[PDB]
Design an enzyme around this catalytic site. Structure first.
Site, PDB file in Angstrom:
ATOM      1  N   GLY A 162      70.288  22.439 -68.922  1.00 11.13           N
ATOM      2  CA  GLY A 162      71.559  22.278 -68.213  1.00 11.13           C
ATOM      3  C   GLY A 162      72.380  23.554 -68.106  1.00 11.13           C
ATOM      4  O   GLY A 162      73.617  23.510 -68.048  1.00 11.13           O
TER       5      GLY A 162
ATOM      6  N   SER B 172      72.817  25.743 -65.723  1.00 10.74           N
ATOM      7  CA  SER B 172      73.598  25.924 -64.506  1.00 10.74           C
ATOM      8  C   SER B 172      74.956  25.230 -64.633  1.00 10.74           C
ATOM      9  O   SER B 172      75.974  25.775 -64.214  1.00 10.74           O
ATOM     10  CB  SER B 172      72.821  25.446 -63.270  1.00 10.74           C
ATOM     11  N   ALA B 173      74.962  24.038 -65.226  1.00  8.08           N
ATOM     12  CA  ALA B 173      76.202  23.322 -65.499  1.00  8.08           C
ATOM     13  C   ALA B 173      77.077  24.068 -66.500  1.00  8.08           C
ATOM     14  O   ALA B 173      78.288  24.151 -66.318  1.00  8.08           O
ATOM     15  CB  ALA B 173      75.916  21.909 -65.990  1.00  8.08           C
TER      16      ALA B 173
ATOM     17  N   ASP C 181      74.705  16.733 -66.755  1.00  9.60           N
ATOM     18  CA  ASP C 181      74.700  18.142 -67.148  1.00  9.60           C
ATOM     19  C   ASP C 181      76.122  18.678 -67.286  1.00  9.60           C
ATOM     20  O   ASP C 181      76.491  19.193 -68.340  1.00  9.60           O
ATOM     21  CB  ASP C 181      73.900  18.993 -66.153  1.00  9.60           C
TER      22      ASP C 181
END
Ligand SMILES: C[C@@](O)(CCO)CC(=O)[O-]
Length: 326
Positions: free
Chosen positions: A110, A112-113, A155
């Site tokens: 996760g 990118s989140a 995420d």
């Protein structure tokens, strides 16, 4: 349009990493999932860039080889979505962004989140927007649209709130609530080095259900029983039971054909070296596996074992889920 109040952030603007403990794939079909926001985080620092328009990204995250370069074009879209969402205009004076934190960006974590959450918190500080967690989470959700895709919300939610989180599709979108837990979770998280397409694997699972409604229903029901017990094990603080249930969950994941040889090698070695439980985490067919250790010292032996005996264990991380309460 928001104008900058501070010239440089001085806070600790972070987004947590994420591992799915229970319920990947089955959650799509209405089952409850347990998602863990880990302690390890991505940090975003911001400062004004007078006379220099736009966002300058100094990305120094300890990402796996090639990851940052691979995800850069998505990141551009993602950050711009956040900037637009928060009504931030960088056409005159822009921003210098530093991205750090100990979280290792890799598929399934996760990351990118974590990135867009850290960025949203950093923007809230610089522009003095006083964003609630709800508002940070939405900003991240919007930004996550820049990566593909599509975001379930799990995420970003794990990245902004942290800790253990119950995730289900209800009435009829993604619903999240915190899970209270009084013990530290010592995790070994392992990257395969293989990137799978969430959309494809999910659609393959959809097809399996179509082809075998009765068989799939049984596996689905078998899962709902596991997560029910997992919740009780968490309330009790029985980590041994939780681990056994993680193994049982992995078995169901193999039966919906979302495992692979590399993931099998990792989980086998993890269990051999004393993991309470070990399973694939997330999309499967690559990505990450997650193992639960009883302690920090027992986590050492698993890491040792993976390095020595499991060549499929390309990347090995010690991650932790901090207890919510005393
Ligand atoms: C496979 C899945 O359950 C997890 C992928 O990270 C999909 C989803 O929850 O949206």
């Amino acid at each position: 349009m928001s104008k900058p109040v501070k010239s440089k952030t001085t806070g600790k603007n972070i987004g947590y990493g994420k591992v799915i403990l229970f319920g990947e794939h089955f959650v799509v079909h209405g089952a409850e999932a347990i998602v863990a926001g880990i302690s390890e985080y991505t940090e975003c620092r911001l400062e004004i860039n007078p006379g220099v328009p736009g966002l300058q990204v100094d990305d120094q995250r300890p990402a796996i080889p090639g990851y940052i370069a691979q995800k850069r074009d998505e990141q551009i879209k993602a950050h711009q979505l956040v900037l637009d969402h928060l009504k931030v205009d960088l056409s005159g004076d822009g921003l210098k962004m530093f991205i750090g934190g100990p979280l290792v960006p890799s598929s399934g974590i996760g990351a990118s989140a974590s990135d867009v959450v850290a960025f949203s918190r950093a923007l809230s500080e610089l522009y003095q927007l006083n964003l609630t967690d709800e508002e940070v989470n939405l900003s991240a959700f919007v930004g996550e649209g820049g990566y593909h895709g599509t975001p379930s919300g799990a995420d970003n939610t794990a990245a902004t709130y942290g800790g253990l989180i119950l995730y289900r599709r209800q009435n009829g979108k993604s619903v999240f609530k915190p899970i209270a837990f009084q013990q530290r979770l010592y995790l070994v998280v392992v990257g395969t080095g293989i990137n799978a397409s969430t959309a494809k694997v999910v659609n393959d699972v959809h097809k399996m259900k179509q082809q075998q409604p009765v068989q799939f229903k049984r596996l689905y029901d078998n899962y709902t029983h596991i997560v029910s017990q997992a919740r009780e094990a968490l309330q009790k603080g029985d980590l041994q039971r939780l681990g056994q249930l993680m193994n049982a969950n992995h078995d169901l994941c193999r039966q919906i054909d979302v495992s692979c040889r590399e993931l099998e090698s990792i989980v086998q070695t993890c269990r051999t070296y004393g993991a309470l439980g070990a399973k694939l985490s997330g999309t499967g067919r690559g990505g990450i596996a997650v193992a639960l250790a009883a302690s920090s010292d027992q986590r050492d032996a698993i890491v040792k074992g993976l390095k020595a005996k499991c060549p499929e264990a390309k990347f090995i991380w010690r991650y932790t889920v901090q207890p919510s309460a005393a």
